[PDB]
Amino acid sequence: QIRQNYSTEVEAAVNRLVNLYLRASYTYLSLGFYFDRDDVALEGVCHFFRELAEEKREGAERLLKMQNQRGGRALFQDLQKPSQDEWGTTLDAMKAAIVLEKSLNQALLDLHALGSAQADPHLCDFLESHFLDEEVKLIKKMGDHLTNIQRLVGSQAGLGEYLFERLTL
């Protein structure tokens, strides 16, 4: 058929990466709707996480497309529910988001390493081009948000969270 230079080890890892991105999308959907609760009511934070839910879903879709293009076979698994039901303050959430992104980034790096070992340059380039750069930029932006939240919620935590939501997000 069309499959060429596409190992079963890479195929399986791409399937696992699809699951991790859909899991992340689901986490962001839960973060977003938590900040839209009447008793939380931070619309800018809700909007930030809803946008990330969409981006992670797009990530998954491009991986699946790539899997089909190389002749691998997509296999879906159960998607685990997010690690929490309530996500605390904006500070707590942005910390949980950075931890999540770093674990996706690490999965991307692990797949790139596997691609290198297997001499699969198309895999390596596809990750380089569509995932690694974007993760780095996103992680930087979250770290920046995290620094600003912290400087704000030193004293007067309520006031600080409100101003962050209104003036940054």
Give the binding site for Cl ion (CB under 5 A): 4
Q: Is 128 in the site for ligand O (CB under 6 A)?
A: no
**Residue 58 binds to ligand O (criterion: CB under 6 A):** yes
Q: Kindly indicate which of the ranges 52-60, 83-91, 92-100, 101-109 contains the residues binding ligand O, using the contact rule CB under 6 A.
A: 52-60
When asked if residue 86 is in the footprint of Fe ion (CB under 5 A), the reply is yes
| Minimum CB distance to Cl ion smaller for 23 or for 70 | 70
Gap between the terminal Cα atoms of the chain: 49
Burial 58-68, CB ≥16 within 10 A → b, else e: ebbeebbebbe
Do residues 22 and 64 make contact, with C-beta atoms less than 8 angstroms apart? no
CB-based burial, 32-49: b 16+ in 10 Å, e otherwise = bebbbeeebebeebbebb
**10: number of Cβ within 10 Å:** 20
Give which of its own copies, ligand O, Cl ion, none residue 21 binds (C-beta under 5 to 8 Å, depending on kind).
none
Q: Residues annotated as binding site for Fe cation?
A: 51, 54-55, 58, 61
What span, in angstroms and rounded, lies between the C-alpha atoms of 11 and 34? 35
Question: Which C-beta is closer to its own copies: that of 9 or that of 122?
Answer: 122
Does residue 85 interact with Fe ion by CB under 5 A? Answer: yes
How far apart are alpha carbons 156 and 154 in whole angstroms? 7
Q: Report the alpha-carbon distance of residue 45 to residue 168 in Å, rounded.
A: 10
Nearer to ligand O, 104 or 114 (CB): 104
Closest to Fe ion by CB, 47 vs 95, is 47
Q: Which residues form the interface with Fe ion (CB under 5 A)?
A: 43, 51, 54, 58, 73, 85-86, 124, 128, 144
Q: Which residues form the interface with ligand O (CB under 6 A)?
A: 36, 43, 51, 54-55, 58
